[PDB]
Design a protein around this ligand. Structure first.
Ligand SMILES: *[C@@H]1O[C@H](CO)[C@@H](O[C@@H]2O[C@H](CO)[C@@H](O)[C@H](O)[C@H]2NC(C)=O)[C@H](O)[C@H]1NC(C)=O
Ligand SMILES: [Ca+2]
Ligand SMILES: [Ca+2]
Ligand SMILES: [Ca+2]
Ligand SMILES: [Ca+2]
Ligand SMILES: [Ca+2]
Ligand SMILES: [Ca+2]
Ligand SMILES: [Ca+2]
Ligand SMILES: [Cl-]
Ligand SMILES: [Zn+2]
Length: 417
C-alpha cells in the first residue's frame, strides 16, 4: 500500500501577470516553482504530494476571458481545462494565477470536492502578495476545496498557528493544515475515490527544477527520502539524494531491502481477466507500466467485453450496489429509461436528462431484481442527487450480443473502440 497521494498540477499564468511583472518570465517561473514547493511541504503533513507537471504562461493572449467575476472566471477556466488542456497534458489539477483584481475581497475560488473531475478539478488564485508563502497558502487552500475540504470552524487545530483552511488570509500565515482538513480530505478520498491522484509521477513528468529533499524522485537523483531529519530510508543518503554503498535501489515497487526484487515477483495485481498482472524484471527497481488487454475482447464467460482492465457486467454492478443475492432485472424494467425523468434516462447533455431510445435502454440507469425478504422489487435502481451518475450502467458494459455501452448508447463492440 502506497500511503501518499500525488496531485499532478498544471499552473496557468495569465497575461495580466506577465504585464504586472514587466514581462519578466524568469521571475514568474521561479515564483511558481517556489509556490509549488511550498504547497508540497504543506501537503506532506496530510500524506500528499503537490507536483508541477505543467507551467503555462499566457504571454500572447489569454485563452479565456479573465474577469473580476470569480464565478464566470472559475467556470470559463474549468471549461478550457477540460476541453483543451486535458487533451494536451495528463494531469490531475489546474490552477489559474491571475494579475487582475477579483471583484470584492476574494483572492481564491475553487469547486468543492472536485479532485480528478475533468472540468471541476481547477482553482483560480489572485496574485495577492510578493511573499511567496502567502501565495502558496492561497493555492494550497483552493486545492483544499478541490479535495472536498471546507473552511475550518469550531476547534479545528494546527498548532497555535493560523490554519490554511481558515476563511480569510492571515497576515503571517502558516504551512499547516488543521485536523479537520486532514479528516475531510481522506474522508473525501474514502467516499468519492479520486483515482487520478494515486500514481507517483515519473521524474520526467515533473517540469520544475529537481530539488533534493522534497520527497519527489526527480531527474538526476538516485533516491529522495526528504530532509536528513525526516528520512527513514536506509538505502538513501538524504542530503545528497545518492544511493549508499551496496544499494542497487532506494525506491520503487520492485525494490526491497535496497535490492532489486527478483524476476517474476508481482508488483501490480491483476484487477480482472482484462488486466494482465505486471511483475518485477529482476533488472530494475520499478514495476513495469500498467498494461490492459484490448478493449472489446470477450470476457467473463461471454457476459462482458473488456473495458480498460475491467469486464463491466450488469450482474456485478447490481452486486456492488445492492449485495449478494441481487440479479439482473428483466428487460421491461429498463423501459423506465425512456422517461427522461430524475432517474430514468441514458445520458445528460448540458445538464438535461436525455431519455433512452428503444435500442439504448440498457445503457441508462441500471435495474436489478431484488428479492430481499419483505422488500421485493423487480426493478430496483439506485438514485441519489449527491451523485446522479451512481447507479447508471458503466461504460463498456455489454448491453446485447456484440454490443457495449458508450455514452449511453448500446453500440457495436467492433467499432466502439
Ligand atoms: C482537533 O484537535 C483539537 C485539539 O486537539 C480538538 O479540540 C479539543 O476537543 C474539544 C471539542 O471536542 C475542545 O472543546 C477541547 O477543548 C479541545 N482540546 C484542546 C483545544 O486542547 C478538536 O476536537 C479536534 N478536531 C476535530 C474535528 O477532530
Ligand atoms: Ca493527453
Ligand atoms: Ca479585489
Ligand atoms: Ca495523477
Ligand atoms: Ca527530489
Ligand atoms: Ca496490468
Ligand atoms: Ca428479460
Ligand atoms: Ca441503478
Ligand atoms: Cl416513476
Ligand atoms: Zn475557501
Amino acid at each position: 500500500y502506497d500511503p501518499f497521494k500525488y496531485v499532478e498540477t498544471v499552473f496557468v499564468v495569465d497575461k495580466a501577470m506577465v504585464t504586472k511583472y514587466n514581462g519578466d518570465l524568469d521571475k514568474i517561473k521561479t515564483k511558481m516553482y517556489e509556490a509549488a514547493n511550498n504547497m508540497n511541504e504543506m501537503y506532506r503533513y496530510m500524506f500528499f504530494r503537490v507536483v508541477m507537471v505543467g507551467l503555462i504562461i499566457w504571454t500572447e493572449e489569454d485563452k479565456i476571458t479573465v474577469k473580476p467575476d470569480v464565478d464566470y472566471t472559475l467556470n470559463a477556466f474549468a471549461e478550457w481545462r477540460k476541453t483543451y488542456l486535458l487533451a494536451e497534458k495528463k494531469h490531475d489539477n489546474a490552477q489559474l494565477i491571475t494579475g487582475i483584481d477579483f471583484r470584492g475581497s476574494i483572492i481564491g475560488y475553487a469547486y468543492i470536492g472536485s479532485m480528478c473531475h475533468p472540468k471541476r478539478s481547477v482553482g483560480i488564485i489572485q496574485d495577492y502578495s510578493p511573499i511567496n508563502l502567502v501565495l502558496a497558502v492561497i493555492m494550497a487552500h483552493e486545492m483544499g476545496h478541490n479535495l472536498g475540504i471546507h473552511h475550518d470552524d469550531g476547534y479545528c487545530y494546527c498548532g497555535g498557528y493560523p490554519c490554511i483552511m481558515g476563511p480569510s488570509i492571515s497576515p503571517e500565515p502558516s504551512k499547516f493544515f488543521s485536523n479537520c482538513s486532514y479528516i475531510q480530505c481522506w474522508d473525501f478520498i474514502m467516499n468519492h475515490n479520486p483515482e487520478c491522484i494515486d500514481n507517483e509521477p515519473l521524474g520526467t513528468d515533473i517540469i520544475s527544477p529537481p530539488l533534493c529533499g522534497n520527497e519527489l524522485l526527480e531527474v538526476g537523483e538516485e533516491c529522495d527520502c526528504g530532509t536528513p531529519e525526516n528520512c527513514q530510508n536506509p538505502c538513501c543518503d538524504a542530503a545528497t539524494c545518492k544511493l549508499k554503498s551496496g544499494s542497487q535501489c532506494g525506491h520503487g515497487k520492485c525494490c526491497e531491502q535496497c535490492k532489486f526484487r527478483t524476476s517474476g515477483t508481482e508488483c501490480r495485481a491483476s484487477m480482472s481477466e482484462c488486466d494482465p498482472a505486471e511483475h518485477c524484471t529482476g533488472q530494475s527497481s520499478e514495476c513495469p507500466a500498467d498494461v490492459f488487454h484490448k478493449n472489446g475482447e470477450p470476457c467473463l464467460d461471454n457476459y462482458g467485453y473488456c473495458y480498460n482492465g475491467n469486464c463491466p457486467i450488469m450482474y456485478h454492478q447490481c452486486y456492488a450496489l445492492f449485495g449478494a443475492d441481487i440479479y439482473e432485472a428483466e428487460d421491461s424494467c429498463f423501459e423506465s429509461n425512456k422517461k427522461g425523468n430524475y432517474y430514468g434516462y441514458c445520458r445528460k447533455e448540458n445538464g438535461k436528462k436525455i431519455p433512452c431510445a428503444s435500442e439504448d435502454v440498457k445503457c441508462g440507469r441500471l435495474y436489478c431484481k431484488d428479492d430481499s425478504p419483505g422488500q421485493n422489487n423487480p426493478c430496483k435502481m439506485f438514485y441519489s442527487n449527491d451523485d446522479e451518475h451512481k447507479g447508471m450502467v458503466l461504460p463498456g458494459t455489454k448491453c446485447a450480443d456484440g454490443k457495449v455501452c458508450s455514452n449511453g448508447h448500446c453500440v457495436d463492440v467492433t467499432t466502439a473502440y
